[model samples]
Target: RVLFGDWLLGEVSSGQYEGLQWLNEARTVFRVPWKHFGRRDLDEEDAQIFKAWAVARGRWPPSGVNLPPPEAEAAERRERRGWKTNFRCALHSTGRFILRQDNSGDPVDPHKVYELSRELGS
Candidate 1:
């Protein structure tokens, strides 16, 4: 089954830096299925596995840890109802990973690639 993940930022879009207009650049950010841990259809084990995959890639933080500085700052701005971000990640049923930005569509040359870790299933 196909599931849509949540929106993620392409870069810092708040504070004294660039704003949401940064999303206009293609491939700057992405959305993916591994970030969808809030789905009601997902069981606890499924959620853990998907989150684990993202954490392995350094996309998601480990439990009970603070977000890194940039992300933390962004979160603070978001809490203030500042701006909305537009990016998505998806896992294809055919075992492909998809990255997309809401305004620019697919990335021309996406460098944020992921591969199975050799130590994961050992």
Candidate 2:
């Protein structure tokens, strides 16, 4: 129940921002639940929650209308083909409220740090 490979500048890559100076405010790859969601079986409560969200926003799971993250400035237009980055920036901090932890207690750990220390100011 895990995504094998989807990372930045890695071997089996899902996203590539190679040699690009500034990546466009992307949440690091492997961010989505590829393995779990790809399967047809979804838990009842989980399914109901997702369905509720979809009904509220009038869109399906893969495309939900949650709040946008802060300071995100990328907005590539969708045309005849290709991509249009609607929005990006880490993820919903509210997500932290209902999170399960890894054995190591990290969800998105690009760097294998024992602990992440950042100074937050109000």
Candidate 3:
């Protein structure tokens, strides 16, 4: 299976035909073309998936095709940059916090602490 954010594409076999199937986080299945058709009516979500697939196959931006800006990656980057600050703010608000130990009973690394805080904060 090939994953693209919340989207996935994988080959499936039927009785007589085998083709790629597209799936999203909602578990909704969408039809996938074996080749890029340069269609412009695709929704933003589908467009992103199609662009990613095409780019991986070196078939992107087929003549006259314009796709929406890739804001998803930018949004994820912004969220990642904020995790440290967010964790610090949470700690400051709480004033006191305990460090979690690993299964081996060793204190977790500071970087890992920040990562856990990010996951918990969200």
Candidate 4:
């Protein structure tokens, strides 16, 4: 699976800034599975693991929190939002670890790169 487009400057298009920046800089669009969000009870250890991985690459944001290149997918406010974000970063980094690819590999397919619901006429 690959990261697909979700929004644009003022409207929703296929992903943006972070998406393009990440694809070129990291040469990978690591997607954190969505399930990690929307949960009340979450694990901090898992989140920290990803942070370590991103830092291990020595390319993650300097602040290393709430920034892109390893940032969480943007979302509306919700009860578990913060947890969702930290856990979300974990997911993105984990994708890279599991795939075991770095720099360059695999061509991205647009059909697989767009985030939309078929039911909504994507």
Whose TM-score is greatest here?
Answer: 3
TM-score of each: 0.21, 0.21, 0.23, 0.20
| Tens digits of per-residue lDDT for model 4, 1-122 | 22312211111122332222223333233322223223444344323333333334443554544635323422112213454454345444432233323322222421112222224432
Question: lDDT, candidate 1, residue 24?
Answer: 34
Clashing pairs in 4: 4-113, 5-14, 5-15, 6-15
Model 2 Cα lDDT, one tens digit per residue, 11-96: 21323321212223442322322113233344332233233333333344344335363311111111101110111111122222
Regions of model 2 farther than 4 Å from truth: 1-37, 60-100, 103-122
Which of the two candidates, 2 or 3, achieves a greater lDDT against the reference? 3
In candidate 3, where is summed lDDT lowest over 10 consecutive residues?
A: 109-118
Which candidate, 1 or 4, has the higher TM-score? 1
Candidate 1 lDDT tens digits, 22-96: 323453342222322232343332233334434445554556248797786554333221111112223332133
lDDT of 3 by residue, 27-105 (tens): 2333222222233233333233334444444443334234345764443333332332332343335322233322222
Candidate 2 is scored at a TM of: 0.21
Higher-ranked by lDDT: 3 or 4: 4
Q: Which residue pairs of candidate 1 clash?
A: 31-88, 31-89, 32-88, 32-89, 32-90, 33-89
Clash-forming residue pairs, model 2 = none
